[PDB]
């Protein structure tokens, strides 16, 4: 058998049997990423302290002015 299970009309020979099974497409798949691409594009060490310090510098002045208005 095995030439009556995989017919492929013609083929003249036991080789050239159909042989259609699963696999990667011709040319493989896309290059798959595996590294750790963690983007560190956030606020830096400064700009976070200076936003906090800047908020403290101006916002506490605003607390003071609000205390003046309340008084």
């Amino acid at each position: 058998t095995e030439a009556m299970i995989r017919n492929k009309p013609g083929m003249a020979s036991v080789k050239d049997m159909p042989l259609l099974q699963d696999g990667p497409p011709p040319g493989g798949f896309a290059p798959v990423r595996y590294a750790r691409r963690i983007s560190n594009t956030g606020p830096s060490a400064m700009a976070m302290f200076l936003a906090v310090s800047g908020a403290f510098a101006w916002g506490m002045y605003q607390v003071g002015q609000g205390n003046k208005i309340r008084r």
Binding site: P9, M11, A12, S13
Partner: protein, 429 residues
């Protein structure tokens, strides 16, 4: 030397074509039963010795050296009456050389029964006529009744002191029953199924009694071998192979005929001289099955200079069986012819052993596919391997006789098989 030329005074089987009377008053004129009393009186050892010296080989497919075969029979009789079964039955495809001895000079066959019987210490001869040879065994029973009435056979061998009687058995249409170890059984009354060789017929054959199975042509040339010269007989053919085989040019020759002619004859010479010629000239030849049907093909490129003797045809990757040369010309479908041969071996295979019983139906199926082209280019190597699985393993040589036609067809005409397969492939799609 250069063989082939056999003069009409050297042909052993005179009245082959039945032109003259076959029976007595017509056989004594041809030298039959001439002085067999002296021969029987010359003894058994002298007969065996002259048969061995004459180098007579088996006229049947086996090709065994006769005489040496007759020396296998026991000398001192231990109560088992040594028999002598004559293998009249042929049934080989192509072979009619037996059919021209059973009729048309059967008295040579009866005198050979007697001379081989005294030769191998026998006590009775069972001429196993092929079943279909009804007219032939009727002629032979007529000649047997004659040789009984003429005191030749029975209770005194031609007036001598030898008690020897010839009984005529006849099978019924079975090529397998013709085999040496199956003749004994098909004559013992059982089915025509061969027995294994470890008990040899010379040791325990017919009825368990010793016996030797001889083709009619070997037993029938025995008389004239002894009455003429064993040196004269061995003066024909090549060194080892010697004698005058009775050929049967079977098919696709413009004048098919069975004609006795010296062995070691060039196959081309035989064809061109006696049977006329390959239909449409020698250049029209396609293949030739030189022996019976139990022998591979000859593809016409090694058939020009091949000699019809056992040794050369065996050296050409073939065999000289009953020398029933089957000729096939460029007009035949050689694969269909070998497919019908394999069908024959499927039909006439007593089925006793598995390698032949099954693999021969298998060979027939694969051949009836490849003759259309329904196979695959690698099956031609399965077919070779299937045949080599059948060949050495079967009980008798019928396994051989069924693997050899297909093996020869492959070995020689593999281009034609592959061409049919590729043409089937291109016919699809």
């Amino acid at each position: 030397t250069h063989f082939g030329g056999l003069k009409d005074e050297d042909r052993i089987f005179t009245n082959l074509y039945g032109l003259h009377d076959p029976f007595l008053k017509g056989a004594m004129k041809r030298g039959d039963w001439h002085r067999t009393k002296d021969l029987v009186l010359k003894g058994t050892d002298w007969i065996v010795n002259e048969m061995k010296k004459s180098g007579l080989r088996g006229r049947g497919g086996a090709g065994f050296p006769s005489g040496l075969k007759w020396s296998f029979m026991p000398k001192v009789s231990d109560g088992r009456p040594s028999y002598l079964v004559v293998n009249a039955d042929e049934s080989e495809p192509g072979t009619c050389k037996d059919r021209e001895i059973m009729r048309h000079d059967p008295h040579k066959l009866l005198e050979g029964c007697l001379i081989a019987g005294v030769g191998m210490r026998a006590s009775a001869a069972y001429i196993y006529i092929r079943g279909e040879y009804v007219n032939e065994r009727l002629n032979l029973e007529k000649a047997r009744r004659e040789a009984y009435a003429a005191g030749l056979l029975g209770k005194n061998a031609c007036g001598s002191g030898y008690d020897f009687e010839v009984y005529i058995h006849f099978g019924a249409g079975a090529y397998i029953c013709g085999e040496e170890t199956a003749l004994l059984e098909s004559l013992e009354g059982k089915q025509g199924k061969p027995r294994l060789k470890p008990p040899f017929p010379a040791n325990a054959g017919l009825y368990g009694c010793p016996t030797t199975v001889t083709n009619v042509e070997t037993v029938a040339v025995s008389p004239t071998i002894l009455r003429r010269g064993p040196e004269w007989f061995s003066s024909f053919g090549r060194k080892n192979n010697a004698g005058t085989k009775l050929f049967c040019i079977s098919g696709h020759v413009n004048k098919p005929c069975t004609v006795e002619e010296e062995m070691s004859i060039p196959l081309k010479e035989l064809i061109e001289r006696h049977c006329g010629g390959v239909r449409g000239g020698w250049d029209n030849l396609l293949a030739i099955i030189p022996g019976g049907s139990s022998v591979p093909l000859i593809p016409k490129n090694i058939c020009e200079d091949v000699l019809m003797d056992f040794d050369a045809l065996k050296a050409v990757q073939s065999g000289l069986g009953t020398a029933a040369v089957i000729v096939m010309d460029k007009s035949t479908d050689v694969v269909d012819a070998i497919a019908r041969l394999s069908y024959f071996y499927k039909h006439e295979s007593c089925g006793q052993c598995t390698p032949c019983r099954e693999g021969t139906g298998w060979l027939w199926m694969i051949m009836e596919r490849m003759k259309v082209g329904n196979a695959k280019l690698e099956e031609i190597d399965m077919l070779q391997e299937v045949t080599k699985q059948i060949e050495g393993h079967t009980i008798c040589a019928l396994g051989d006789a069924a693997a050899w036609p297909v093996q020869g067809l492959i070995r020689h005409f593999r281009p034609e098989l592959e061409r049919r397969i590729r043409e089937r492939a291109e016919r699809e799609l």
